[PDB]
Design a protein around this ligand. Sequence first.
Ligand SMILES: Cc1ncc(COP(=O)(O)O)c(CN[C@@H](CC(=O)O)C(=O)O)c1O
Ligand SMILES: Cc1ncc(COP(=O)(O)O)c(CN[C@@H](CC(=O)O)C(=O)O)c1O
Lengths: 382, 382
Amino acid sequence: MRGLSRRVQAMKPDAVVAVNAKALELRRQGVDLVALTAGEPDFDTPEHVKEAARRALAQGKTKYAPPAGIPELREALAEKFRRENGLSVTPEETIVTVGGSQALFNLFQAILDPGDEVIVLSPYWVSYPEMVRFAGGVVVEVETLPEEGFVPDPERVRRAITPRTKALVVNSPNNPTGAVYPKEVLEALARLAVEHDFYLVSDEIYEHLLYEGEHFSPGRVAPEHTLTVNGAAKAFAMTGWRIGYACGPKEVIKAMASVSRQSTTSPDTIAQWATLEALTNQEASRAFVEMAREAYRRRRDLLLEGLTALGLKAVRPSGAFYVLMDTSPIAPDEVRAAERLLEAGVAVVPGTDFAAFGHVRLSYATSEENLRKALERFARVL
Amino acid sequence: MRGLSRRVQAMKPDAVVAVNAKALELRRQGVDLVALTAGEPDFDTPEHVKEAARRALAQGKTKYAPPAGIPELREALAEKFRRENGLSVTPEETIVTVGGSQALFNLFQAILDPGDEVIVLSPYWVSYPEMVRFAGGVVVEVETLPEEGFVPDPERVRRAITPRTKALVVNSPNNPTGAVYPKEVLEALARLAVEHDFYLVSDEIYEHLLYEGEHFSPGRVAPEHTLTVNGAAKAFAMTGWRIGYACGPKEVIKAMASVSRQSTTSPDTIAQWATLEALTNQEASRAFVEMAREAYRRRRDLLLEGLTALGLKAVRPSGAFYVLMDTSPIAPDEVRAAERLLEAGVAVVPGTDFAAFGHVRLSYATSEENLRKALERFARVL
Ligand SMILES: Cc1ncc(COP(=O)(O)O)c(CN[C@@H](CC(=O)O)C(=O)O)c1O
Ligand SMILES: Cc1ncc(COP(=O)(O)O)c(CN[C@@H](CC(=O)O)C(=O)O)c1O
């Protein structure tokens, strides 16, 4: 008989997708509300990358591509993870997916049998649990503390390991805290995976938005259990392009390529060519990477000051582009504080779903003129 | 502990993906083998559509888009299904997905609880069962006969309806038979869905490659149970673009939008703008549609003749671009016949996986010069 399934019936809505829609419509019915919501640059994808997407169209590069992605993008990927991430993978252990989202979604479906446990460390990015659950798994969450700077303590984690525990999700830089996990913690979590036999998913998609610290890929350590998950969506202002990449054990890679086929067949072919240009033309991308990074650092400092100038508490991020801001003042909860703040003319994402209660998540990847126009409304409301 | 899941472990490989790879490498180890394998035009996506993808890049239209797709492409979609398909949907009941594949894959995950039954009519396109199974459902297949011209008989179907039966998959035009189901059969199958309360998935992606007959969208009939699934991949030579669309009950649409988000977030933003141009600039697309259709009809007739001239039996398709060709002569099975034929210098897809035993599936969407270079090898082998 008819009716929706119960796995798509049990999923919780995106807090981000929900807040955006809202913001938008008001921008439509009069309303000019500065929106510090979504995690996407304001910068437009570099010209050297665009030129190549035109060059792709021009050469009629519009046919189907392997479910695992074109052999070229695939090869440059084996040098990115290599040259940059220090990892040592051959192209067969590489895979192009439809965003960072696909590489995780395919990843969880290929290693999660119903009832398997996956340890997420809170606060976490809104999706991880929903993906881990849509696959049949169960969310075992380890807390990470503001007093500890949100960097995880491998003992609270080791403690969480059951015989069901199949995977552990680490994210450095971190959404929504901005925390950059230091080599040793990362190297520690890796050995837990090796010691208790489980996969370590490592979502290093903000590896480049690293203001202070060094970026360590845990995969260098546990190459047989680690599953690195990157993406060309943050580093190159390519959020609308929907290109992601990942790597790890050959074994689990082809399995992700299988789910890749039944679902999307393979990602855009024009977009894979453009992405290749971002990975191979170094001189031009490095120039852009650095350029963007500084505008982000500047915005961070500008925000973090003004926040502190109103006495609004928030932890200092060393990566990505989010600042978790305690709303204790504006209102009791994260919810109402957001409804208060939206009136003031500022769209923020409540940290209820990130397991960041009390706080609200704001993004400084937007204009400078805007962090300011927002910072002024906070004043009144404050 | 480690290891792959059992849902990605139980899936059978793509016969098409497998044959292609093969063909390629040989073209890639000396070998010039005419390949009538994949279902994709040789024509390159129209200029009016490409111009707009450049116009999109030019205006920096490269940010994230709603999981359900940009509101514009979404609105033109409510007029396509309306104006063209006679359906009556508002944009909320429209959805943009990553190809026709995604719209089905999201569709089966949103309405399939484990053990639910889905009736596929054989011969069917290679994926349907694989998707229906990856979701937990079970494949209950109704046969369609070459003597009946592959068009289904609603009684063998009515007969197959159990209390588990959740969905029924119809495909007109048909891959791999080319059969265009007549208004009344389609209108009948719809009433079974209404009578026994179940969803009718209708994969009308070749609606435009209709040489002889009229195209009926069953959704006009059972608007509450029908789930129309189209795609801009065949009509506009946009296979590499990966854009698909669908519509039906608001209820099931947002559920598909949910799975859409956790998996890909949303499709390419450049590509959604280009697609919009294909749907709104009529004068220019109709011109292309007709233009392509005739080159396809010509190739069909050219194939169907030469096939018959060698006494090779095959049914006459009135749609899409495949011809199911009985290999009884070349060899006993479909498998070996293909291995025989590959020697002759011709890549064909064995009909073992389409439930089209004895036959082999060949595509005439390729060059004319090629159907002929293939037709000559058949001779010798024959
Ligand atoms: C922590 C994390 N990991 C992966 C991704 C996915 O990248 P894409 O596939 O979507 O490009 C993201 C992405 N994004 C942001 C904004 C969003 O649209 O979800 C966020 O929620 O901060 C993140 O975080
Ligand atoms: C019957 C049918 N439905 C869906 C698709 C794929 O939709 P898109 O997402 O690629 O637009 C196809 C198309 N082509 C192939 C299958 C494949 O391997 O791509 C086929 O005809 O062999 C078809 O048929």
